[PDB]
Design a binder for this molecule. Structure first.
Ligand SMILES: Nc1ncnc2c1ncn2[C@@H]1O[C@H](COP(=O)(O)OP(=O)(O)OP(=O)(O)O)[C@@H](O)[C@H]1O
Ligand SMILES: Nc1ncnc2c1ncn2[C@@H]1O[C@H](COP(=O)(O)OP(=O)(O)OP(=O)(O)O)[C@@H](O)[C@H]1O
Ligand SMILES: O=c1[nH]cnc2n[nH]cc12
Ligand SMILES: [Ca+2]
Ligand SMILES: [Zn+2]
Ligand SMILES: [Zn+2]
Lengths: 694, 146, 49, 48
């Protein structure tokens, strides 16, 4: 593996048909027999690992202990028609058969899988690199074909990305994707987060901040994968282990708890449909259920208690599952604003930014970057701004001890961490906790869950308060959430048009009060009339209440103007009221809703069209890649896959800096400097080597 | 074929075969596709309408019960909101089909201690149910056309 | 897919599809690794014929 | 119509240079090319 790593280092910054690449190909040809021997050593054991798991092999497996004889192995393995005589003999020799010629094939298959994995992967990387940089050497396809099984086995783990390299050229990078990273990426919640992020950027984002947003999303997703890892499942100690198990159980099943709460609310309301009010006990009145079964009354009480419990558990699961991500994101943005902007060193927001004003409470706290990974942010800010703004002033602002920095660099102290609750008491950072609780209580999802819990509690004071939890169907169902977004899209326009309707109805009220008062008698009686327009407030209420809801306007309700000195004036009054209020303004409301529908639909279509017509990374359209068949699909799955950039970021984070290669160090330094010039913009490997490849 | 067979049991079952005009005529098939395109959205908005009408039913049952006497007689009243099921049926049946909402059907709240509460009740019912949700249904159809 | 299992071993599986040698091809392709007799039982073939 | 007018104006301003008319795609070959072109090279405020 070390030798192959040296070879790969020789291939750094190597152009297509490069001298070093062709020299390496010639060297491999010079040792063709040995390279074939190595590739054969790998492929026989790779094939054995899957053969021993085959039903055809298990048919020959007959010993109850789980073993197989050498002769049985011989007749089973040549039945697969995959190895030759010498290869089967070699496998028999390598098998540690006992004096009874019994073979433990379970351990035999797994003996060399782990030891050979690293060298196998590096051989796959080397052959892939040579094949993609010397594409017209007939001697190399023989090695590629002999290494077909190795390449196929390592295909899911061989990640490749393209960067703008150290030499002002597009370079292709090969690295290793781990099984855990790929599996965590393929989780449905992470896929949904990816879809949401893609929609946000492609819809309401620009080209300038796109790569910044993508990297921020990658970091957030890495933190989410860590959260999933911790919450995943395979006297103080016992209570602690049970507590963390219970909290992880709540976190894993948060959405099932939400669905259960919804179902419980539905059941409670279905029972509530049977309520009946009677003056007789089951001058005030009694409310009671009216059913013959007799179990609905206890069932309602049980369901109410269970619904309250489920709501409380949902609150707990949320604060164990999403609150860490909220805090992580806020801490990260605050740290970057401190370092790269000096938000509280240079600009000092002008009291109109409630978020920035609230973040001041956390600056000097001992545990400010609790979730954000960078614990040295205060050090970096000090080193960056202390010379110009004062080391002591910066230290006071960030709550640092200047004397302790030296000793922390000096050595490490190992104190006694006593596992006592009394000692745990003052170990709490009260100011940081206040800041965190403010951040949480300003969060929309937490606020919704808290309102849900509060309404559940009020449901015990009065069971009809459980009707409010039926509104949870709006966010529980994505389709209903979209339909309601189709109303909330133009909410300000709807409010403004309602206010305009109020104003125009007020003008009509003024006219009616001044001139058409005799027509607002809504009393069939002759001696006590009920005049609706003898007061401005009463007339305005009458208009806004009956005229707007009337199909033909106010003229439907007020008296007939036939045979009056004001007949024409009043018919103009009624007709204009009908046209402006009933027709035009209500039609405006419907049109605002309908245009919101159309706008949302075309947003979805535009996002899909952009994703299917342009590369998310380089921006080159699908038309260029379609010159070669399936070119865009291969470009987005192998060349510029964004999942591969995310995996590369995780790979850099996990890998040791002293083990970083030249390209990896380049990208890592650019990442830490927050410079996104390594992302290919408007150029790709195929474009750069058009003449050579074609 | 089954409906044709049932038509011999009762000739009025032959009316069902008139629906064959939907697939026999391409234009009508397209017009009906203009409805079936957003069928899930229409079902969801109908369910939402049911939920909001249920909330209004709950409010009416708890507070505005005296206004649901639909009997002109003086000694035997027909109270429509003395049971939750009856009140919910009354709302979903008459309030949705009424042009001005439930306030068109229920009694006049003039000169009552709950006048303003009831006018807010009626106006919000008219705006949310009669205007907004029905407009959403029409818009789903029209967007399917487009 | 669960319903298509009933037709695999039937003598007249490709009645309308033109390829009458599909069972032969599937056997030649997968019998070595998964068992000629098992594939023949799955597809209802007589290896002797 | 009013909504699509606003969208069309925004799209034209974000996709073409107001002065030379060359589209953002040409300037995007160099990263941030259109932004730098409209802030330094062909800024209309600079012509004013
Ligand atoms: N740079 C890019 N990286 C990844 N995908 C890209 C890129 N540029 C464009 N795309 C598009 O992103 C889309 C992502 O695929 P999508 O998430 O819809 O998969 P899918 O159809 O659900 O697949 P599966 O069946 O495997 O679940 C692809 O259709 C691809 O064309
Ligand atoms: N020749 C040009 N000169 C100036 N702007 C141009 C030109 N061609 C296109 N534009 C576009 O004009 C837009 C003008 O920016 P705009 O007035 O929207 O700024 P803004 O987002 O409100 O900025 P700020 O945050 O600084 O107030 C830019 O987005 C730019 O892409
Ligand atoms: O997203 C990240 N970027 C850099 N370093 C990190 N450590 N842990 C997570 C990290
Ligand atoms: Ca090194
Ligand atoms: Zn690309
Ligand atoms: Zn220009």
């Amino acid at each position: 593996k070390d030798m192959v790593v040296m070879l790969l280092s020789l291939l750094e910054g190597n152009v297509v048909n490069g001298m070093i690449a062709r020299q390496m190909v010639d060297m491999l040809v010079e040792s063709s027999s040995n390279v074939e021997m190595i590739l054969k050593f790998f492929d026989m054991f790779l094939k054995l690992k899957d053969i021993v798991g085959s039903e055809a092999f298990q048919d020959y497996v007959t010993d109850p202990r789980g073993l197989i004889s050498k002769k049985d192995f011989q007749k089973a393995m040549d039945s697969q028609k995959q190895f030759t005589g010498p290869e089967i003999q070699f496998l028999l020799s390598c098998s540690e058969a006992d004096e009874n010629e019994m073979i433990n094939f379970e351990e035999f298959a797994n003996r060399f899988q782990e030891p050979a994995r690293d060298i196998g992967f590096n051989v796959a990387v080397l052959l892939t690199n040579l094949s993609e940089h010397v594409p017209h050497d007939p001697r190399l396809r023989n090695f590629l074909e002999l290494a077909e099984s190795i390449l196929e086995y390592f295909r899911p783990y061989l990640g490749r990305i393209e960067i703008m390299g150290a030499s002002r050229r597009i370079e292709r990078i090969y690295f290793e994707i781990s099984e855990t990273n790929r599996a965590q990426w393929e989780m449905p919640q992470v896929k949904e987060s990816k879809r949401q992020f893609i929609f946000d950027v492609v819809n309401e984002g620009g080209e300038a901040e796109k790569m910044e947003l993508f990297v921020s999303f990658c970091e957030d997703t890495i933190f989410e994968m860590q959260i999933a890892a911790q919450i995943s499942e395979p006297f103080w100690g016992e209570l602690e282990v049970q507590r963390v198990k219970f909290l992880n159980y709540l976190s894993r099943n948060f959405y099932t708890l939400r669905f259960l709460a919804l179902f419980l609310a539905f059941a409670i309301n279905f029972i509530l449909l049977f309520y009946k009010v009677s003056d007789s006990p089951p001058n005030m009145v009694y409310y009671f259920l009216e059913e013959s079964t007799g179990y609905m009354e206890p069932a309602l009480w049980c369901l109410s208690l269970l619904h309250t419990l489920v709501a409380f558990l949902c609150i707990i699961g949320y604060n164990c599952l999403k609150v860490p991500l909220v805090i992580f994101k806020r801490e990260k943005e605050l740290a970057r604003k401190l370092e790269f902007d000096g938000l509280y060193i240079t600009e000092q927001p002008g009291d109109d930014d409630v978020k920035g004003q609230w973040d001041r409470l956390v600056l000097n706290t001992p545990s400010f970057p609790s979730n954000y990974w960078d614990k040295f942010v205060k050090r970096k800010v000090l080193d960056k701004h202390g010379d110009i703004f004062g080391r002591e002033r910066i230290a006071e602002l960030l709550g640092m001890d200047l004397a302790s920095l030296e000793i922390t660099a000096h050595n490490e102290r190992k104190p006694d961490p006593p596992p006592g609750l009394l000692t745990w008491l003052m170990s709490i950072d009260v100011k940081y906790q206040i800041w965190k609780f403010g951040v949480i209580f300003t969060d929309n999802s937490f606020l919704y869950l808290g309102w849900y819990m509060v309404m559940s509690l009020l449901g015990h004071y009065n069971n009809f308060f459980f009707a409010a939890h039926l509104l949870d169907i709006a966010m529980g169902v994505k389709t209903l959430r979209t339909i309601l977004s189709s109303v909330t899209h133009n909410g300000k326009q709807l409010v403004m048009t309602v206010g305009l309707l109020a104003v125009v109805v007020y003008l009509y009220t003024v006219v009616a009060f001044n001139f058409f008062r005799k027509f607002y008698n809504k009393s069939e009686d002759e001696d006590e009339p009920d005049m609706k327009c003898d007061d401005m407030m009463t007339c305005y209420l009458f208009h806004m209440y009956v005229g707007v809801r009337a199909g033909g306007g106010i003229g439907d309700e007020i008296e007939d103007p036939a045979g009056d000195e004001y007949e024409l004036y009043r018919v103009v009054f009624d007709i204009t009221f009908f046209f402006f209020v009933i027709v035009i303004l209500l039609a405006i409301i419907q049109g605002l809703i309908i245009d919101a529908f159309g706008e949302l639909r075309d947003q979805q279509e535009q996002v899909k069209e952009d994703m299917e017509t342009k590369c998310f990374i380089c921006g080159i359209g699908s038309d260029y890649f379609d010159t070669t068949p399936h070119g865009f699909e291969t470009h987005t799955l192998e060349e510029h896959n964004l999942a591969n950039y995310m995996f590369f970021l995780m790979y850099l984070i996990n890998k040791d800096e002293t083990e970083h290669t030249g390209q990896e160090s380049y990208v890592w330094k650019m990442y830490q400097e927050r410079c996104w010039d390594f992302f290919p913009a408007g150029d790709c490997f195929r474009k750069q080597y058009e003449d050579q490849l074609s």
